[PDB]
Design a protein around this nucleic acid. Structure first.
Length: 1057
RNA sequence: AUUUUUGUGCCCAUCGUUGGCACUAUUAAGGAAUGGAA
């Protein structure tokens, strides 16, 4: 009914007096050893659950009652823990022994679920419970009664209450003798004499009954047909009928010895930090096991042979590599269902060789088999490329071992085996959520939490005037209560930290009167709408320019903040006790994290829908569609009316010498200014130009590495692209020379570390760039394997391993170190793309809201949504980290502003969809065309068209739109298939132009597999040109832009009623 | 309650002209793809 999202604010604990700091240090220290016992004990508290205790409880999201008990009786911890371990057999009988019922089918999976046999084992919590009543020696029924109550206040099982609340019921209600009516009603009885008024028909006595409505029915006819001496007796008896915690006191006292004197703030803080894992794990593992068998059950589990033989290629001759690392097989390999088509062709020519083999079937020439051999690969090679051309690329080497057993297994079975393999292989390898208390951290909320409060901005300049200090200091201050161990008292103290980002965001204060009003978002973000670009003043420039390089960057963000406040450009920020301080201490370092909660009623009635495509493979594109559109351009979608407001590529330009440098678009500088570095890398190759390759057909061919390198080294080419392609080339050359595996030691470092334009030095955000790193990692890893091996091959029990990495780094720590560093930047480099894409998506999303209204962001991601029923595997995995991360980030970001909503959506194969044309009212598919000059048209393109039009039947409904385009091709220019055949490309481009000169046109286009040009019914591209394709008017625009709109269209109607 | 030298990151043939940017925290596991064009 309301959005509740709080933003975190990281800060640098600012060291103070060594002694002062130490006081906090211990306080922190004591707490740590304090909450751990609660975690070990509350464990036991959950280890005594009773079937009767849960009786009538229910309120479980479709959760087997028996199953729930299983997670509290005992869980999985570490091998060496306080509680006693258990066996993966008696386990099933224990539940039956404890509950008098063979374990349900939901709790049976939990026990079956895998876990670290190496470092973990299940531990009986019920035993520790019996053990719990051992030392405490509390009465079984006593404890059980007390316990039973705990479950009523959700202090056990699931949906537990606030830590403080649980600490205000167990060790709360501080009153020596002050209960519901202890010193109030009891004193009233003696007060009757004090006032000496006849205690008959007192109006106040009636009001409880009168305000609240046998005995009670006899009070309504009290004197209508003054007894009040029966009410007292009844009250005493009614008060004696009620009961409260009895076993609690022994428990409280026990803690004291270990935990220490009890305080709500601590006794409650220590518990919250301790019980976080317990509650989480239970909820988590429970959710996990709930859906664990969800697919596992109905999920086909019978084609093991298919999967078993499918992988046989991993252990087949086909699988050859250095790292010897087996990767999970998937449907995407083999073009999935697509590969079905190609089998026929293979067998068709296979039979032929078998037939041609009959006619010349003699030991005279075995070259036929070798030639039939090479021919095959080529087909696969084209087939893998072709299919990958517009959809990744299936493994061609894996297809070699897949055909090997042609008669072995069937084609359909293989596809069925791949799907089965896909789930079981990994889906089943999801291990069990173990429960272990990790580093804790207590915060200081305004109220109903640990005593605490951050220096007020109104009392910051008011208390600074008393000390006569600079009206403002770039340092945040805060004060909270704490416990001095030595004195065991409740004292207070002041400490401050400087989160620069937080100063500008919402801490720095605007002194000037009539300053700008705060934004709804309440944060000084440029996205929120504060450029924060104040005119850098005279002294400020001196302040920046003259400062040291190190802090030089921070001071700049420092001087701009003060100038904005000086020029009154600093918008006012509303302030409240809405900040929670989170303090965590590691070593002598304390990681303080402050964040506030944000709430905003959801904008359910949206009039603008924005869909984005964060595709790692293709360029990112943003599209916004107006909902309930009314205007000159309107399209009725399924009796729903809208128009496309705008469509554009997501670009992140970076100010550099007055030149926009897109982080996702850049791919390196021109090889013209990269001549010196290029020459050195080129000089390296000459020594090792000798290498062995493999013919497209399959016969390995030996070639000079340089020739490929030369084509690679051109001024027009980019340094980034060449840098990857170099490693790929560098990979292979060193491969041909495993002997000199330590001879490429220097070059590598230069190439990715000390090198002038090292991959580490310069790193773009373009898809190709991340490519360098992955390819980068392979090369270094590829170096060790060839570098680390025994001279003799296939000996001493099939060679040996690469001594992990732990003992494999000893060979070259620097090298190993580089990889860590290389990875290190990649992860941060990966984060950047995610956070950055969100800002731009949000912004344009936000921009639209301001001009049109509340808008929805349609995103392609598979959320942990309810897909119970029918799910599609093709759409199962079509989004990588970028797609996921962005969507999740956006969904996280959307929490900040009003009128913004984020909806996840199963990824689809929308690559040839038509704007406001698909599923409206019927489905309309088209082909991917590409425009280009007649001057440069390769044979590949010339033969590409032939592929589609080739008279070949295909039951599978795929590539049918391509043929129509081809036909459309001919008819469009009014030509004939045979009017052009085997005319190379010299007489092929000559024909168009005459046909192009007659229509006075240029750069003709055609349907290309995975092109950048598409024919759309509507103008989805502002620069899109209008043209009639085969007598049909269409809007020429970039396919990427069209894709964005398609994503937005998917199930748009479901979110409008 | 005075520290006044820093919250975390990203981009670049010219690490600076005030170069140009973006971000919610711990934690958890895992983390399969030889493509460049203002």
């Amino acid at each position: 009914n309301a959005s509740e999202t709080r933003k975190a604010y990281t800060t640098k604990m600012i060291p103070r007096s060594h002694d002062r700091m130490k006081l906090l240090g211990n306080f922190m220290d004591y707490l740590m050893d304090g909450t751990p016992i609660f975690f070990e004990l509350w464990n036991q508290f959950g280890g005594g659950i009773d079937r009767d205790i849960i009786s009538g409880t229910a309120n479980k999201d479709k959760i087997s009652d028996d199953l729930l008990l299983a997670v509290n009786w005992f869980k999985v911890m570490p091998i060496n823990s306080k509680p006693q371990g258990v066996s993966p057999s008696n386990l099933a009988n224990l539940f039956q022994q404890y509950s008098g019922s063979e374990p349900d089918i939901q709790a049976q999976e939990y026990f079956a679920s895998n876990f670290d046999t190496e470092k973990h084992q299940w531990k009986d919590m019920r035993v520790e419970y019996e053990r719990l009543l051992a030392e405490l020696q509390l009465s079984r029924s006593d404890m059980h009664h007390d316990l039973k109550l705990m479950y009523k206040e959700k202090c056990i099982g699931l949906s537990l209450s606030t830590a403080h609340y649980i600490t205000s019921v167990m060790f709360g209600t501080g009153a020596k003798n002050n209960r519901q009516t202890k010193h109030q009603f009891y004193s009233k009885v003696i007060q009757l004499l004090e006032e000496s008024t006849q205690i008959n028909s007192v109006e106040q006595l009636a009001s409880i009954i009168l305000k609240a409505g046998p005995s009670i029915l006899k009070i309504v006819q009290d004197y209508e047909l003054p007894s009040l001496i029966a009410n007292l007796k009844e009250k005493l008896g009614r008060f004696e009928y009620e009961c409260e915690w009895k076993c609690m006191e022994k428990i409280k006292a026990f803690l004291a010895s270990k935990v220490g004197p009890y305080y709500l703030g601590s006794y409650s803080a220590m518990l919250e930090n301790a019980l976080s894992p317990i509650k989480g794990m239970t909820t988590k593992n429970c959710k996990f096991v709930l859906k664990q068998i969800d697919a596992k059950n109905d999920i086909k589990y019978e084609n093991e042979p298919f999967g078993k033989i499918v992988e046989g290629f991993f252990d087949s001759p086909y699988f050859e590599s250095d790292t010897n690392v087996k990767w999970v097989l998937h449907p995407h390999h083999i073009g999935e269902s697509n590969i079905k088509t190609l089998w026929e062709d293979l067998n068709a020519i296979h039979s032929k060789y078998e037939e041609d083999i009959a006619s010349l079937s003699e030991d005279k020439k075995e070259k036929r088999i070798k030639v039939y051999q090479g021919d095959v690969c080529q087909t696969i090679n084209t087939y893998c490329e072709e299919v990958g051309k517009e959809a990744k690329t299936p493994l061609v080497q894996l297809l070699r071992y897949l055909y090997s057993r042609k008669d072995d297994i069937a084609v359909d079975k293989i596809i069925d085996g791949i799907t089965f393999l896909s789930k079981k292989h990994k889906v089943e390898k999801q291990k069990i959520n173990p429960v272990i208390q990790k580093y804790p951290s207590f915060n200081f909320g305004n109220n109903s939490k640990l005593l605490g409060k951050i220096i007020s901005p109104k009392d910051k300049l008011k208390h600074n005037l008393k000390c006569n200090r600079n009206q403002v200091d770039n340092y945040i201050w805060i004060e909270i209560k704490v416990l001095n161990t030595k004195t065991m008292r409740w004292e207070k103290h002041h400490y401050a930290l400087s989160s620069t980002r937080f100063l500008e965001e919402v801490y720095y204060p605007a002194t000037s009167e009539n300053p700008p009003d705060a934004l709804a978002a309440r944060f000084r973000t440029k996205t929120n709408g504060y450029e924060g670009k104040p005119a850098l003043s005279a002294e400020q420039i001196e302040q920046i320019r003259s400062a040291p390089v190190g802090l030089r960057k921070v001071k700049k963000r420092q001087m701009r903040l003060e100038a904005a406040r000086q020029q009154n450009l600093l918008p006012r920020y509303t302030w409240g006790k809405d900040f929670n301080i989170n303090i965590c201490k590691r070593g002598n370092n304390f990681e303080v994290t402050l964040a506030t909660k944000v709430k905003k009623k959801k904008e359910k009635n949206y009039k603008v829908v924005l869909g984005y495509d964060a595709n790692i493979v293709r360029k990112n594109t943003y599209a916004a569609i107006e909902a309930h559109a009314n205007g000159d351009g309107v399209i009725d979608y399924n009796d729903l009316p809208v128009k496309p407001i705008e469509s554009g590529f997501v670009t992140v330009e970076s100010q550099v010498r007055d030149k926009s440098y897109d982080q996702l678009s850049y791919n390196g500088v021109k090889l013209l200014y990269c001549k010196p570095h290029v020459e050195s890398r080129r000089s390296f190759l000459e020594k090792y130009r000798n290498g062995t390759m493999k013919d497209n057909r399959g016969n390995n061919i030996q070639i000079d590495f340089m020739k490929d390198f030369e084509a690679i080294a051109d001024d027009e080419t980019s340094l980034y692209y060449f840098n990857m392609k170099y490693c790929k080339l560098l990979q292979s050359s060193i491969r041909n020379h495993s002997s000199q595996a330590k001879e490429y030691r220097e070059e590598i470092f230069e190439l990715l570390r000390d090198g002038k334009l090292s991959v580490l030095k310069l790193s773009s955000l373009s898809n190709l760039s991340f490519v360098m790193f992955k390819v980068a990692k392979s090369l270094i890893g590829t170096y060790f394997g060839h570098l680390l091996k025994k001279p003799k091959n296939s000996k001493s029990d099939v060679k040996a391993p690469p001594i992990t990495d732990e003992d494999k780094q000893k060979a070259d720590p620097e090298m190993f170190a580089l990889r860590l560093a290389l990875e290190e930047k990649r992860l941060n480099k990966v984060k950047s793309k995610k956070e950055v894409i969100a800002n731009k998506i949000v912004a344009k999303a936000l921009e639209l809201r301001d001009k049109y209204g509340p808008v929805l962001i349609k995103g392609e991601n598979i959320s942990d949504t309810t897909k119970k029923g029918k799910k599609s595997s093709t759409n199962s995995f079509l989004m990588d980290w970028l797609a996921r991360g962005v969507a999740n980030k956006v969904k996280e970001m959307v929490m900040m502003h009003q009128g913004l909503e984020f909806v996840e959506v199963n990824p689809n194969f929308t690559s040839h969809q038509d704007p406001f044309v698909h599923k409206n009212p019927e489905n309309t598919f088209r082909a991917r065309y590409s425009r280009c000059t007649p001057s440069e048209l390769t044979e590949k393109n010339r033969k590409e068209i032939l592929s589609f039009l080739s008279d070949k039947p295909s039951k599978r409904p795929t590539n049918a739109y391509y043929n129509e385009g081809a036909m459309a091709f001919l008819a469009t220019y009014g030509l004939k298939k045979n009017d052009v055949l085997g005319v190379s490309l010299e007489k092929f481009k000559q024909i168009m132009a005459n046909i192009l000169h007659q229509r006075s046109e240029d750069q003709l286009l055609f349907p290309s597999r995975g092109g950048m040009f598409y024919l759309a019914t509507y103008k989805l591209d502002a620069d899109a040109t209008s043209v009639n394709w085969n007598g049909k008017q269409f809007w020429v625009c970039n396919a990427d832009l069209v894709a964005a709109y398609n994503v937005g269209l998917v199930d748009i109607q479901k979110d409008f009623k």
